[PDB]
């Protein structure tokens, strides 16, 4: 019964408090994004900087939402698509130096913002080998778990990055709790039946489904949310739906539909 909500990357004023929270789900906010780049789009070799709207989504805001709702945790997502318009290319000076900077800088950030975990959301690999990427991230997650710094690690794959993320998951599944597979990568014409099929295929690549969350976008891309919710009811009826995530609170905030699908998703998971 996991529900997750990405939030903070658009700097559009959305707050944790705008998002419907059902007391009956395991609720995760995911701050988007921490990036190991400078604002001039220079890589920092794993020293993570803040690229969510942290003047609004402050440490006090994280502490407050968690104090009010005992079922809420807050994680941070790494990478994303762009940094000041440039692609966030995963890049490391060396594996060991990137890992040392990533573990330390994210530990500092997690302690500062009262966070519970990290989500891996790199998508550009034109400047790094897959082995290098997998080693960096696998070590990062393994160390944060061993150091008792995080309770939840996730990855956010889609088909275009299958080579990287299946290698990562197949190797580090014991320390990766959740697979935030991006089903909003598929077409807007996707039917509920097709979605169930697409979910089965993705689940087959990421351990069978126990850890693989369904998802949709509220930003006007991918399968229609109402259609995805229908597919999710079928997966739930089968006893094979671990949870749902939405990209994103910012999208919902700016949308005409507002947050009705966040609510519907959580109601589905708890009913
Ligand atoms: Mg994207």
Provide the number of structural domains found in the chain.
Answer: 1
Distance 64 CA to ligand 1 centre (A): 29
Tokens encoding 14: 């959305």
User: Which backbone phi and psi does 155 adopt, to 5 degrees?
Assistant: -125, 155
Distance 185 CA to ligand 1 centre (A): 8
Report the C-alpha gap between 157 and 49 in whole angstroms: 22
Distance 38 CA to ligand 1 centre (A): 20
CA distances 93 to 29, 43, 101, Å, are: 31, 10, 11
Q: This structure's resolution (angstroms)?
A: 1.6
Alpha-helical (H) ranges within the chain are 59-68, 95-113, 130-146, 162-172, 192-205, 225-237, 249-253, 260-270
Distance 122 CA to ligand 1 centre (A): 10
Report the C-alpha gap between 260 and 150 in whole angstroms: 30
Q: Is 5 a catalytic residue?
A: no
Report the C-alpha gap between 24 and 270 in whole angstroms: 6
Catalytic residue among 5, 123, 162, 262: 123
User: Which backbone phi and psi does 168 adopt, to 5 degrees?
Assistant: -60, -50
- Report the DSSP beta bridge partners of residue 83: 86
Cα 263 from chain centroid (whole Å): 19
Report the C-alpha gap between 140 and 117 in whole angstroms: 12
Query: Of all helices (H) and strands (E), which one includes residue 215?
Result: strand 214-217
CA distances 179 to 17, 64, 247, 253, Å, are: 25, 27, 14, 25
**Residue 51 · residue 35 · CB < 8 Å:** yes
Structural domain that includes position 266: 1-271
N- to C-terminal Cα distance for the chain? 10
Tokens encoding 74: 């807050």
Report the C-alpha gap between 41 and 170 in whole angstroms: 31
User: Which backbone phi and psi does 226 adopt, to 5 degrees?
Assistant: -60, -35
Chain breaks in the chain (C to N over 2.5 A) after: none
The enclosing domain of 37 has a CATH number of 3.20.20.80
């Amino acid at each position: 019964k996991v529900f997750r909500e990405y939030i903070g990357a658009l700097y559009n004023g959305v707050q944790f408090t705008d998002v419907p929270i059902n007391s009956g789900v395991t609720f995760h906010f995911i701050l988007a994004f921490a990036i190991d780049y400078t604002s001039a789009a220079a890589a920092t070799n794993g020293v993570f900087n803040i690229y969510w709207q942290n003047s609004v989504l402050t440490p006090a805001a994280v502490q407050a939402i968690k104090a009010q709702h005992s079922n809420v945790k807050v994680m941070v997502s790494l990478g994303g698509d762009t940094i000041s318009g440039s692609p966030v290319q995963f890049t490391a000076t060396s594996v060991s130096s990137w890992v040392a900077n990533a573990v330390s800088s994210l530990t500092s950030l997690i302690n500062q913002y009262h966070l519970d975990g990290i989500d891996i959301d790199y998508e550009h690999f034109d400047q790094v080998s897959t082995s290098t990427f997998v080693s960096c991230i696998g070590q990062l997650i393994t160390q944060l778990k061993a150091n008792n710094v995080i309770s939840v690690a996730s990855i956010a794959p889609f088909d275009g990055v299958e080579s990287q993320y299946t290698a990562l998951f197949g190797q580090y599944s014991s320390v990766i709790d959740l697979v935030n597979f991006q089903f909003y990568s598929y077409g807007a014409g996707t039917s509920a039946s097709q979605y169930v099929s697409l979910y089965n295929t993705a689940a087959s690549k990421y351990g069978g489904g126990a850890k693989v969350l369904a998802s949709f976008s509220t930003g006007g891309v991918g399968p229609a949310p109402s259609t995805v919710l229908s597919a999710c009811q079928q997966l739930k009826s089968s006893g094979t739906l671990p949870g749902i995530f939405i990209f994103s609170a910012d999208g919902s905030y700016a949308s005409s539909a507002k947050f009705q699908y966040e609510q519907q998703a959580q109601t589905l998971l708890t009913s």
